[PDB]
């Protein structure tokens, strides 16, 4: 009888049935990765377990849990589930709302790689290229949200100036 998970190779040469530990499961990455993980975890479940992990253990491990249940209670009572966490639809502010105001710049960078992505998707599916594209993707999308959190997006050489992003036009003196 088999003792592991994998494929079987009926080798009659050595008169023996070997099985290579090679099973199949799922596992995603990038944005989509957590996307699924979010929709899944039942808020009511973790909250329960947390409350247990709270008043039971010492103040060492109970400390982290206390901070945890906070955000938990938030989505719960508020109702707005943590699924929206991911952005699969990036709205666009009206024109007249934006030195050549930067904003536009970043927006284009998005659509650029966004469309190139869709193209490089319908066509071939070179993994290494796909991921390397998503990278440029996640990076751009965040550029507009809060520029700086990672590097410092800037117009090609000569224009080393962090294009003012959404957050940038909300805060600051």
């Amino acid at each position: 009888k088999s003792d592991v998970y994998g494929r079987v190779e009926v080798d009659l040469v050595r008169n023996v049935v070997r099985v290579v530990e090679s099973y199949d499961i799922d596992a995603r990455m990038g944005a989509e990765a957590i996307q699924q993980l979010l929709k899944e975890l039942d808020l009511e479940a973790l909250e329960k377990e947390l409350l247990e992990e709270m008043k039971h253990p010492s103040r060492a491990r109970r400390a982290k849990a206390r901070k945890r249940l906070e955000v938990v209670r938030a989505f719960l009572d508020s109702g707005n589930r943590p699924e929206w966490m991911i952005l699969e639809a990036v709205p666009v502010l009206p024109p007249d709302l934006r030195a050549t105001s930067d904003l536009n710049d970043l927006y284009r960078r998005l659509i650029n790689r966004n469309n190139r992505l869709k193209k490089l998707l319908a066509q071939g599916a070179p993994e290494i290229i796909i991921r390397n594209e998503k990278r440029m993707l996640q990076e751009a999308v965040d550029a507009l949200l809060d520029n700086g959190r990672r590097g410092a997006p800037v117009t090609n050489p000569g224009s080393d100036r962090p294009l003012r992003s959404l957050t940038d036009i909300l805060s600051g003196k």
Partner: protein
């Protein structure tokens, strides 16, 4: 871990990783694409031999 998977390619577990690697399934943890491809979808690395040289092991010892 966030930036480690979000931007990079480090994949996170999702279902049941029955197989091990020194320890059972990682439930919802993550590892390198190497091991992923290696252990998960299976691994089998070859090992050529020099011209006219015997080994020190049987067929499938």
């Amino acid at each position: 871990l966030e930036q480690v998977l979000y931007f990079s390619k480090y994949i996170v577990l999702d279902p049941k990783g029955a197989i091990l690697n020194g320890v059972p399934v990682e439930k919802r943890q993550l590892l390198t694409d190497e091991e992923y491809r290696e252990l998960r979808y299976g691994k089998q690395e070859t090992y050529p031999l020099p011209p006219g040289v015997d080994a020190l092991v049987k067929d499938g010892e």
